[PDB]
Design a protein around this ligand. Structure first.
Ligand SMILES: Nc1ncnc2c1ncn2[C@@H]1O[C@H](COP(=O)(O)OP(=O)(O)O)[C@@H](O)[C@H]1O
Ligand SMILES: Nc1ncnc2c1ncn2[C@@H]1O[C@H](COP(=O)(O)OP(=O)(O)O)[C@@H](O)[C@H]1O
Lengths: 99, 370, 24, 370
C-alpha cells in the first residue's frame, strides 16, 4: 500500500487508479465469498467412493441436501443446471462402476 | 480491435492530444485553420493551403486564422475535420484513423447536434474502432486524484462548474456560461483599440492572446486598484514595437467575474461556482466547498485564486472552509484524465462500438453519454 | 520538475492550495 | 442448532439488533433504504445501489430515502428483507440466518398479514431455526424490573398503551393511535414551511428530524407560550446556514397531546394512557396509576414528563398517586427486554420451530402470539 501511497504522492495516478478499479479483486472476492458456503464441504466424494447401491442413494441424498444452500449463495440458474448434469455424469459413472 | 487508445481534448482554442497510457500530452497546438491571404508569385514558397499546427505560429504574418469551435460548439465542421486529420497527420501521431479507440472530450451541456455530428465524422470520415465522449470535469478529477469535488474550469471559450460527489455527477447542478479566454482576449483587444493600437487582424488577435497570457493579472479589490495608477507594463511586439497597457492589465480579466462590463446579463465565475454548489443538496454543500478543483487555461491568471477565495468567501456561509486546489498541470488536467480513464478496462466496457453505432446512430451515443 | 517544464504554460511559483484561515 | 439468539427490535424509526444476553444493542442503524439519485460517471465511485445504516447516513445527500415500514406496517417487503440481510451481513453480525433463534418485536394490534409475511421471510428467505414474535410492552417491563405497569411507548411510528398487571396483560384495554415521531417530524416540516423554510427531499427530511431531536421541547401549558410569541432561537444546518424557529419548537410536539392539529379526530397520548387505564378493572386503577413506564424515542422531548404528569393528573380522579417511571434507556428498553427474554430458557418453549411452521403455517404464529 505504501508503494501506491508514494505514487499518489508523485501524482502518477495512472497506476493508483488502475490498481483500484481495474483489478477485479473486489467483485472476485464478493462473488467468491458468495459461493463459498455452497462450494464448501460438498459430499460428492461419497458417490465416487461408494460401492453399494445403498451408498449410491445415500450419497445422492446427502448431496441434494447439501445443495439447498442456494438463496444465500446467488449461484447462476443455468450454471446450477450445468453442475447438476455433471452430478448425473458422476452418477452414471458410478452406475456403470457398480454395474 | 483495441490498440493503444487516443485521447483528444477539443479545447476551444488549444487542442490537446496524445495516446492513452501516456503521462503528458505531447501534441498541443492551437485550434484553428490558417489559410494564406496574400498572392503567390515565387515558386518554392510554403507548402499547402491550410496551416494547422505549429507552422501557423511560425508563419502567422501570412495567414487568415479562422476558429472552428466557438463556445465549445463547432461552426465550421470542415475545419474540425481538417484539424482532426492533422492530429492523425505524419507530424502529430502518424497512426491511422482505423486503429485506435478515440476518447473525445466535450464541454458540458453542448447541443445534441454537436455530439451527433462528431459521431458522424469519427465513424464515417475516420473509421475508428471505438469512440467515447465524456465531460471534461470527470477527467480533471482523475488527473487530480480525487473522487469528490466541483470542477470549475475555464477553457478558452466555455467556463462551467460541475459538482461531482463521490464519483456521482449531479446534472441538475451544472452551471455553464460561455465567457472565457476568448472573451477576455477580445475585451482586451477593445481596450487596446481605445489605447491607440488598433489590433484588428487575425494575427494581431493572437498577439492579444499572448498579451493576455503574459501581462494581465487579476484584481483583489478593483476599486482600491482603480483609484491608483499601476505598473504600466511594456510589452514588446514581434515587430519590435512597444505597447503599454496601463490599468487595463487588471481590467481585462474582470470580465470573468463580471460580465456586465461586456454588456451581458449573466453570472460571474464566482456566481457559477457558488450556484453550482447551492443547486445541489444540503448534506453535500460543506464537502463541496471544501473541495474546489480548478482546471482550464483561463484560471492561470496571476492573482486569480486569491480573488476567487475572497469572492466565494464573501458569498458562501459563515466560516465554512472553502478549499481550492489548483495544480500546476491545470492546462492538461482534462488530457491527463482522459489518459487515465482510457488506460483502463472499464474503458473497454465503456466506449461505443462501431458496429453498434452503425446499427443505431445518434441514439447510441445519447444513451452512453454518461 | 522536468515534466512540468517541458510544456508551454504551467503555473510556476504559485501556491497550489487556496483555503480560508483557521479561527472558525 | 442455536447459539445466542438474535434479538431484533423491528421499529419503524430505527432498527435495534444484537445477540441475546448482550446488555446493550450493538447495532442501532436507522430503518430506511437509501438509493442514489445522481448518475455515476466517474469509475471507482461508491459501489452498490442500496445503502443501509452507517453508509446511508454519511452520504445522505446523495441518497433518496424510502422508509420501508410505516406506522408499524411493512409496505415494501423487499426493503425489509434487505435491511434484515444487512443485519446479518459482514459489517453488522457476520452470522448465518440458520444458526441463531430470532426474537423480532412487533407493535400490538398489527394486522395478521404482518405476522404471516414476517415469518414467511424469516422461514423462507432466511432459514431461521427459531422465531418468536413478541409485544413491545412486556419487554420494557422486563428491562425495567417491574412486572406490573402501564407501558406507554411512543416509537417513531405507533404509540400505544398496554396495562400489564403482575405479568398478566389485559388485551382489551390496549389503546393504540397511529400518531408518533414521524407525524411530529412531518408536522414540524409544515411549520417550517409556514416559517418560510421548505424541505421536500427525502434526504432533507432527516434534517427535519435533526431539528426535532435537537431543538424541540414541550411547554407545560399550551397557551402560556402560544400568545407570548417568544424568541427565535437559531439552529445551524449541516451546511452552515441558519434557521431561527420560535413558535415551532413547541407547537410541533403538541401534536402528540392533541392530534386535532393534524386534522384527525383521535385521542392524545394522555388520553391513550388514561383510557387504557380506565378501561381496565376497577380494583386495578391505583397500581396502574403508580406504575407508568415510558418507552420509545418520542418520550424524550424536553418537558415531556411534566406534561404527561399534568395531563394524567387532570384526567385521573383526585388525590390518586401518579408515578411515571422514566428510565434512561427509553430507546433501548424494548431491545434490552428482548435480550433478557431470549437469554432465558422458557423462550425455548415459547418459540416456533421450523417444522412447526411447515406443518402448520400462519396458524402456529397466531397461536403463540401471546
Ligand atoms: N498564463 C496564462 N495566463 C492567462 N491565461 C492563460 C494563460 N495560459 C493560457 N491562458 C488562457 O487559456 C486559454 C487556453 O484555453 P484552454 O484552457 O486550454 O482550453 P481547453 O482547456 O478547453 O483546452 C488561452 O486561450 C489563454 O487565454
Ligand atoms: N433525543 C430525542 N428527543 C426527542 N425525540 C427523539 C430523540 N431521539 C429520537 N427521537 C425520536 O424518536 C424516534 C426514535 O424511534 P423509536 O422511538 O425507537 O421508534 P421505534 O420504537 O419504532 O424504533 C426517532 O425517530 C425520533 O423521531
Amino acid at each position: 500500500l505504501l508503494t501506491l501511497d508514494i505514487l499518489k504522492h508523485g501524482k502518477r495516478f495512472h497506476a493508483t487508479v488502475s490498481f483500484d478499479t481495474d483489478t477485479g479483486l473486489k467483485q472476485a472476492l464478493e462473488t467468491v465469498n458468495d459461493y463459498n458456503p455452497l462450494m464448501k464441504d460438498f459430499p460428492l466424494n461419497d458417490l465416487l467412493s461408494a460401492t453399494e447401491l445403498d451408498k449410491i442413494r445415500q450419497a445422492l441424498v446427502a448431496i441434494f441436501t447439501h445443495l439447498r444452500k442456494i438463496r444465500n449463495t446467488k449461484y447462476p440458474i443455468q450454471r446450477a443446471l450445468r453442475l447438476v448434469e455433471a452430478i448425473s455424469r458422476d452418477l452414471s459413472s458410478q452406475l456403470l462402476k457398480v454395474l | 480491435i483495441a490498440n493503444q487508445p487516443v485521447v483528444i481534448d477539443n479545447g476551444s482554442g488549444v487542442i490537446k492530444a496524445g495516446f492513452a497510457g501516456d503521462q503528458i500530452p505531447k501534441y498541443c497546438f492551437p485550434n484553428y485553420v490558417g489559410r494564406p491571404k496574400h498572392v503567390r508569385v515565387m515558386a518554392g514558397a510554403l507548402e499547402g493551403d491550410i496551416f494547422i499546427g505549429p507552422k501557423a505560429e511560425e508563419h502567422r504574418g501570412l495567414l487568415s486564422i479562422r476558429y472552428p469551435m466557438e463556445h465549445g460548439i463547432v461552426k465550421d465542421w470542415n475545419d474540425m475535420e481538417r484539424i482532426w486529420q492533422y492530429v492523425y497527420s505524419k507530424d502529430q501521431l502518424q497512426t491511422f484513423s482505423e486503429e485506435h479507440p478515440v476518447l473525445l472530450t466535450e464541454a458540458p451541456l453542448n447541443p445534441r447536434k454537436n455530439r451527433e455530428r462528431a459521431a458522424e465524422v469519427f465513424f464515417e470520415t475516420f473509421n475508428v474502432p471505438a469512440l467515447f465522449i465524456s465531460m471534461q470535469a470527470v477527467l480533471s478529477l482523475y488527473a487530480t486524484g480525487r473522487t469528490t469535488g466541483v470542477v470549475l474550469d475555464s477553457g478558452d471559450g466555455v467556463t462551467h462548474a460541475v459538482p461531482i460527489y463521490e464519483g456521482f455527477a449531479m446534472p441538475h447542478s451544472i452551471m455553464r456560461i460561455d465567457i472565457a479566454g476568448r472573451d477576455v482576449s477580445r475585451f482586451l483587444r477593445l481596450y487596446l483599440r481605445k489605447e491607440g493600437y488598433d489590433f484588428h487582424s487575425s494575427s494581431e488577435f493572437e498577439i492579444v492572446k499572448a498579451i493576455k497570457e503574459r501581462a494581465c493579472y487579476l484584481s483583489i479589490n478593483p476599486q482600491k486598484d482603480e483609484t491608483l495608477e499601476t505598473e504600466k507594463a511594456q510589452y514588446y511586439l514581434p515587430d519590435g514595437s512597444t505597447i503599454e497597457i496601463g490599468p487595463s492589465r487588471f481590467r481585462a480579466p474582470e470580465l470573468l467575474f463580471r460580465p456586465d462590463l461586456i454588456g451581458e446579463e449573466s453570472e460571474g465565475i464566482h456566481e457559477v461556482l457558488v450556484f453550482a454548489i447551492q443547486k445541489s443538496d444540503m448534506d453535500l454543500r460543506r464537502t463541496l466547498f471544501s473541495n474546489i478543483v480548478l482546471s482550464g487555461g483561463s484560471t492561470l491568471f496571476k492573482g486569480f485564486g486569491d480573488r476567487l477565495l475572497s469572492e466565494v468567501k464573501k458569498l458562501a456561509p459563515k466560516d465554512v472552509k472553502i478549499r481550492i486546489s489548483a495544480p500546476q498541470e491545470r492546462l492538461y488536467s482534462t488530457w491527463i484524465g482522459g489518459s487515465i480513464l482510457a488506460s483502463l478496462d472499464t474503458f473497454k466496457k465503456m466506449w461505443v462500438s462501431k458496429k453498434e453505432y452503425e446499427e443505431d446512430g445518434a441514439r447510441s451515443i445519447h444513451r452512453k453519454t454518461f | 520538475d522536468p515534466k512540468y517544464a517541458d510544456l508551454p504554460g504551467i503555473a510556476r511559483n504559485e501556491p497550489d492550495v487556496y483555503e480560508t484561515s483557521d479561527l472558525p
